[PDB]
């Protein structure tokens, strides 16, 4: 949140879920810090950099986190295109 002065005033900004585009509260303990390791294109070993995501707890509790992770892998191209 900004103001009329021109500097930041809020204490911190919360994260965003990557499926329903909602925030994760400070007392919601079902959040995910999933990282998927992308590899080198000619060898296949781990390079060093990660690829992080976040899914809120209500999507887990309904049970659609797996297809959400599959769609994010489809968008990032980590999983195969035809599948």
């Amino acid at each position: 949140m900004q103001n009329d002065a021109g500097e930041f005033v809020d204490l911190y900004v919360p994260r965003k879920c990557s499926a329903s585009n909602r925030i994760i509260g400070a007392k919601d303990h079902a959040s995910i810090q999933m990282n998927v390791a992308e590899v080198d294109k000619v060898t296949g070993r781990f390079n060093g950099q990660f690829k992080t995501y976040a899914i809120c707890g209500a999507i887990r509790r309904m049970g659609e986190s797996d297809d959400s992770i599959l769609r994010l892998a489809k968008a990032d191209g980590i999983v195969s295109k035809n599948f």
Binding site: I32, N35, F46, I55, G63, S65, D66, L70, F83
Partner: protein, 217 residues
């Protein structure tokens, strides 16, 4: 697995799948497994599509190798079908095993002796291990469950569709998941057959243990 052609069925993994039986499942449909499947046939056995199983096995391997320290990966089993497989999986990778009678409050109650704060959970079966999935809600634990056609999809993050009722299927898939994570860690090459034994991760009954050790030397 990526568009690069180094991480697919070479010639023999599909043959091992058809020999073990990781392709045919139960007899009831699930609404979260409507795409990891092809068709119900006569005798009522649903057939799981295999490339999707391979892609989520690569996805689970990537999620395991993505974290730097392997000592805080809790592998969980309670059923007698996969007691040996998770123990030798933790021996091969360096994971922390729990085999038989998972204690409630292991991740929640902190003053007890059996306490652990891990970072990743790897579950053999969602229906049998419904208690680690409940304890994975209160603390931020992502999970991977080797799911079936008759397994509810609750509090799960990566689902690998397979028949987790035969000992050969679970032993082979735990073994090749260990193979994939040691290949991605940078210790095992893809060019040569390194393999120790697919039967080395297999659970077997004491009666067949007795009769085959009496028949053999």
């Amino acid at each position: 697995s990526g568009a690069l052609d180094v991480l697919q069925m070479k010639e023999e993994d599909v043959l091992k799948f058809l020999a073990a039986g990781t392709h045919l499942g139960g007899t009831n449909l699930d609404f979260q497994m409507e795409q990891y499947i092809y068709k119900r046939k006569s005798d009522g056995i649903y057939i799981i599509n295999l490339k999707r199983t391979w892609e989520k096995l690569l996805l689970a391997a990537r999620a395991i190798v993505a974290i730097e320290n392997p000592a805080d990966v809790s592998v969980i089993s309670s059923r007698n079908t996969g007691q040996r497989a998770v123990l030798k999986f933790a021996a091969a990778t360096g994971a922390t095993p729990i085999a038989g009678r998972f204690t409630p409050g292991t991740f929640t109650n902190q003053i007890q002796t059996a306490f652990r704060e891990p970072r990743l959970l790897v579950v053999t079966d969602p229906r049998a291990d419904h208690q680690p999935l409940t304890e994975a809600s209160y603390v931020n634990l992502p999970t991977i469950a080797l799911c079936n056609t008759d397994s509810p999809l609750r509090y799960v993050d990566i689902a690998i569709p397979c028949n987790n009722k035969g000992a050969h299927s679970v032993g082979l898939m735990w073994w090749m998941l260990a193979r994939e994570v040691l290949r991605m860690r940078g210790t095992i090459s893809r060019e040569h057959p390194w393999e120790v034994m697919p039967d080395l991760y297999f659970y077997r009954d004491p009666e067949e243990i007795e009769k085959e050790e009496q028949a053999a030397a």
